[PDB]
């Protein structure tokens, strides 16, 4: 896949959590998981094209966390081949470094306290995993080789049985 996974960044981005972890919204504005979505409320339902499936995580056709209803967030394709993303505030980890990671998904090693329900926005479960769905390839054409698996996620107290594609 051209110039998307070639030099995006290593999956082991440097820097760790120097201390407490809080919320942040850098208004960052997605071939690779090194991205930051933005919280978007009311939107003009004119240029949106194709499915609008959003990740609960359980995909379902002003997003909010399952504890507060709504959904974590989602992405869409619209206009002339442009991808847009949205979701809860991009989770950030308190630390130091030239390229400190603003975790948009689960990231254990770089920070011990980061659970998806509290530190994830989009469909990235782990840096090398995705929640498969019919338009997954339509949205992330760089992830064809990933192998499918079946997983159980306990969000709050609700158990979700879903298939996830991860590299191996």
């Amino acid at each position, epitope marked *: 896949c051209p110039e998307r996974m070639a030099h995006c960044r290593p999956i082991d981005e440097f820097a760790q959590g120097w201390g407490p972890i809080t919320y942040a919204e850098g208004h960052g504005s997605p071939y690779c998981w090194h991205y930051a979505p933005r919280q978007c409320g009311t939107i003009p339902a004119s240029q949106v094209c194709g499915p609008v499936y959003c990740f609960t995580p359980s995909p379902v056709v002003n997003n909010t966390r399952p504890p507060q209803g709504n959904w974590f967030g989602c992405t869409w394709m619209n206009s002339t081949g442009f991808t847009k993303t949205c979701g809860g505030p991009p989770c950030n980890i308190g630390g130091v470094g030239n390229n400190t990671l603003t975790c948009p998904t*689960d990231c*254990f*090693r770089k920070h011990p306290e980061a*659970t998806y329900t509290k530190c994830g926005s989009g469909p990235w*479960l*782990t840096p090398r*995993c995705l929640v498969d769905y019919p338009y997954r390839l339509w949205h992330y054409p760089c992830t064809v080789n990933f192998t499918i*698996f*079946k*997983v*159980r*996620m*306990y969000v709050g*107290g609700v*158990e979700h049985r879903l298939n996830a594609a*991860c590299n*191996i």
Partner: antibody
Framework: QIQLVQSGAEVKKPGSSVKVSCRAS????????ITWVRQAPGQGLEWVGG????????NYAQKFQDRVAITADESTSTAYMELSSLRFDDTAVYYC????????????????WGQGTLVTVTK | VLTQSPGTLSLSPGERATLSCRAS???????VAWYQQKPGQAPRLLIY???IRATGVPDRFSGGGSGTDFTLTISRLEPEDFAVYYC????????FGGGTKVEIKR
């Protein structure tokens, strides 16, 4: 399904650490969780911890938190369990097990166990 | 949260025995697994979900339950059925149960 569960610290001293190991021969390491369950000499089996070496987020039972660290090394196909703050009650045998299906935040049922290793805490 | 009613138990071959594991408060969404420990060997799996049998085990060991009081019926006992049977519930609240004893020396 061949577990070479390492005999670790057979004899220890109170307050010290123990570093037990388990190895999964064959198959494809990185798709099935390794689960550690202990049992005292005569007692019931108590869940201790578990890991799934693809979603790096080991789970521990509520009463075994901040005191147990479970790690896995994909390169060598080895799951280590480091148990700290030993007490005279810890005298037990710590088995190894496989999780039938991957779990994130939960557990599962142990399909194929491994050899039980004795870890005696004495002074 | 989970306990076994019968406590100790002793019988002779060709008998029917019942063991009951109590799901205290939550229905738990039908998650159960039963083990069998011999006097020194590692435990082995017999049932999971309380309704599906494992591979390599005879039909003698049965499963059943709906909501609460999952059961493990041991009919037509044999000399090779001396073991301290164990109960656990998995899912979101993994916690083993109590160990009912069994004696086949009769």
């Amino acid at each position: 399904q061949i577990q070479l569960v390492q005999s670790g610290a057979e004899v220890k001293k109170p307050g010290s650490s123990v570093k037990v190991s388990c190895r999964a021969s064959g198959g494809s390491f990185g798709t099935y969780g390794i689960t550690w369950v202990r049992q005292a000499p005569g007692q019931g089996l108590e869940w201790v911890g578990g890991i799934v070496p693809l979603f790096d987020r080991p789970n521990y039972a509520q009463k075994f938190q901040d005191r147990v660290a479970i790690t896995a090394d994909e390169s060598t196909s080895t799951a280590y369990m480091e148990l700290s703050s030993l007490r005279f009650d810890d005298t037990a045998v710590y088995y190894c097990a496989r999780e039938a299906d991957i779990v994130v935040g939960g557990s599962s049922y142990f399909d194929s166990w491994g050899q039980g290793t004795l870890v005696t805490v004495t002074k | 949260v989970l306990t076994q009613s019968p406590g100790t138990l002793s019988l002779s071959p060709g008998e029917r025995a019942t063991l009951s594991c109590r799901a205290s408060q939550s229905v738990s969404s039908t998650y159960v697994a039963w083990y069998q420990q011999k006097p020194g060997q590692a435990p082995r799996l017999l049932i999971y979900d309380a309704s599906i049998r494992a591979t390599g085990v005879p039909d003698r060991f049965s499963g059943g339950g709906s909501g609460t009081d999952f059961t493990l019926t041991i009919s037509r006992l044999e000399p090779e059925d001396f073991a301290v049977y164990y109960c656990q519930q998995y899912g979101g609240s993994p916690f083993f149960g109590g160990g009912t004893k069994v004696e086949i020396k009769r």
